[PDB]
Scaffold this active site. Structure first.
Site, PDB file in Angstrom:
ATOM      1  N   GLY A   1     -29.168  12.038 -25.282  1.00  0.00           N
ATOM      2  CA  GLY A   1     -29.904  12.936 -24.711  1.00  0.00           C
ATOM      3  C   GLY A   1     -29.719  14.143 -24.772  1.00  0.00           C
ATOM      4  O   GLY A   1     -28.636  14.907 -25.075  1.00  0.00           O
TER       5      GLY A   1
ATOM      6  N   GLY B   1     -27.928  21.929 -23.973  1.00  0.00           N
ATOM      7  CA  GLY B   1     -26.867  20.966 -24.406  1.00  0.00           C
ATOM      8  C   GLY B   1     -27.530  20.032 -24.850  1.00  0.00           C
ATOM      9  O   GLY B   1     -28.458  19.303 -24.386  1.00  0.00           O
TER      10      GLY B   1
ATOM     11  N   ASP C   1     -17.893  10.368 -11.216  1.00  0.00           N
ATOM     12  CA  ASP C   1     -17.304  11.289 -12.037  1.00  0.00           C
ATOM     13  C   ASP C   1     -17.370  12.523 -11.182  1.00  0.00           C
ATOM     14  O   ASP C   1     -17.636  13.708 -11.665  1.00  0.00           O
ATOM     15  CB  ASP C   1     -18.740  11.468 -13.227  1.00  0.00           C
ATOM     16  CG  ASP C   1     -17.907  11.960 -14.565  1.00  0.00           C
ATOM     17  OD1 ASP C   1     -16.866  12.406 -14.452  1.00  0.00           O
ATOM     18  OD2 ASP C   1     -18.460  11.545 -15.593  1.00  0.00           O
TER      19      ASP C   1
END
Ligand SMILES: Cc1ccc(NC(=O)c2ccnc(C(F)(F)F)c2)cc1-c1cc(OCCO)nc(N2CCOCC2)c1
Ligand SMILES: Cc1ccc(NC(=O)c2ccnc(C(F)(F)F)c2)cc1-c1cc(OCCO)nc(N2CCOCC2)c1
Lengths: 265, 255
Positions: free
Chosen positions: B21, B16, B128
């Site tokens: 990044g 991903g 999160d």
């Protein structure tokens, strides 16, 4: 950097095993944990230094195939906390419960063990007591390497009977512990997986093993491997059990050899 | 002292990418997951955000937190963790239509409570916590982490005070209540709200709340109560994770 766990946070639960130097309990600390505590509150200097050393090498490890060190406690007793694993050892699977693993599962156990041992040597850590009883099969699947021995720690004047089968001939001679002695014990673990047996099954007593293996007149019978054992595993096994230390492979090459074999299925 | 020298990690398949990044699958004493910055000259915000990320990960040693394994500073700022096989709780619950037993759902909530109770004990706010950051390692054990990559999507788990714009242990508890909602209903909250701008506005004004009646009929009565407590509108009316974990563990031993 402070893995100390304050007094009163861990609920010491059922007792699971004890010897000299410590007792191990199942515990509750943000979930299930394994707690090992010294039996006494006034510890001897040798006991205290073994506590520092054990924590010192455990806080150096972060790997899926090494038993997860989680913290330590110094009051009221010197304690060490690790994760809780369900299941049993590889030794119990292979030699007590008669657990029949498919060959794909046997190679995978060897591969995970090679990963953890390759990790320990990279961190400059000699295990010194690698045997199928200290290779835990977490949920009968993932390997957790540790030192589950509640063995009596050295005194000020001490200079094993359940680890002789995995001792290199130079460790027996004691004239000792290195990366190659860990490699030798790994080959005996390979022997267990591929043969389904402990070495020297036809030897009645342990004193004959100590003297004969230390003198070069005894070696594991490699002919007892199962027929579906991979050919390149028979060789790597014998390479790990070479009598001379400087002829057995280092774990990087060991792991790579095994990772290749696994992709061949 | 967890630095990993240059040249020891073999970067494999890319998993991903974001705006800053990218994370790859890697080989380093076995399988590892590596997240690297795309650039080589890092800005102070990047270098310090790298320090912070490593700084809070090197304080975690728990079976239900993503195992931090090391970092590298050359040629790219990288962070190395264990590789987990499988997919997230979000993917299991909302894309793969995976039917978990009620016993397995309570188990996932229990492990998640263990990971959150541990993070808070280490004075760590997740900020999160959502079903996409709860990885189901080998379809069984929970791995809580931050698998999000920033690209220049977490509204459903935001407390009314976080939406108002904020983060505390209590807002982490609220997101856990929404994660509890997912497990017990099999649905995301506000399925009948057409757009997200309406969610942000109505939830922030207290006029919108998750429909708790959509829970499965076999949901334990005390899980309903604890779910509504975690979703309380006032911050100081939500329980702390110690009492949350104890409640779920009792419930699980009660079967
Ligand atoms: C509690 C504990 C603390 C420290 C340690 N220390 C090491 O592991 C160690 C020492 C030196 N070097 C290394 C090296 F790996 F870094 F080399 C590792 C072990 C235990 C422990 C003992 C034990 O005894 C009971 C056996 O059933 N059972 C378990 N469990 C039983 C099954 O479920 C959960 C785990 C855990
Ligand atoms: C590579 C990496 C490095 C550091 C971190 N840092 C944290 O997780 C973190 C930071 C601060 N605090 C916490 C707390 F949880 F402790 F709070 C956690 C994550 C990754 C990473 C990224 C990611 O992107 C997802 C690709 O789908 N996928 C994975 N793999 C998914 C597939 O199998 C294995 C795992 C791993």
């Amino acid at each position: 950097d402070d893995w100390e766990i304050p007094d009163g946070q861990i609920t010491v639960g059922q007792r699971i095993g004890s010897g000299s130097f410590g007792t191990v309990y199942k515990g509750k600390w943000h979930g299930d944990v394994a707690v090992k505590m010294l039996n006494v509150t006034a510890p001897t200097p040798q006991q205290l230094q073994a506590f520092k050393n054990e924590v010192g090498v455990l806080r150096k490890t972060r790997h899926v195939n090494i038993l997860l060190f989680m913290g330590y406690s110094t009051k009221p007793q010197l304690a060490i906390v690790t994760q809780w694993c369900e299941g049993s050892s590889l030794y119990h699977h292979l030699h007590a419960s008669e657990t029949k693993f498919e060959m794909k599962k046997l190679i995978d156990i060897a591969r995970q063990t090679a990963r953890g041992m390759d990790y320990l040597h990279a961190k400059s850590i000699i295990h010194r007591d690698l045997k199928s009883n200290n290779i835990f099969l977490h949920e009968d699947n993932t390997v957790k390497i540790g030192d589950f021995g509640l063995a009596t720690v050295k005194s000020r004047w001490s200079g094993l009977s359940g680890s002789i089968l995995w001792m290199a001939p130079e460790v027996i001679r004691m004239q000792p512990y290195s990366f190659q002695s860990d490699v030798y014990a790994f080959g005996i673990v390979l022997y267990e997986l591929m043969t389904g047996q402990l070495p020297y099954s036809n030897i009645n007593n342990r004193d004959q093993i100590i003297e004969m293996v230390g003198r070069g007149s005894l070696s594991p019978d490699l002919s007892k491997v199962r027929s579906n054992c991979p050919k390149r595993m028979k060789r790597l096994m014998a390479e790990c059990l070479k009598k001379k230390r400087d002829e057995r492979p280092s774990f990087p090459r060991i792991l790579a050899e095994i990772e290749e074999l696994a992709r061949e299925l």
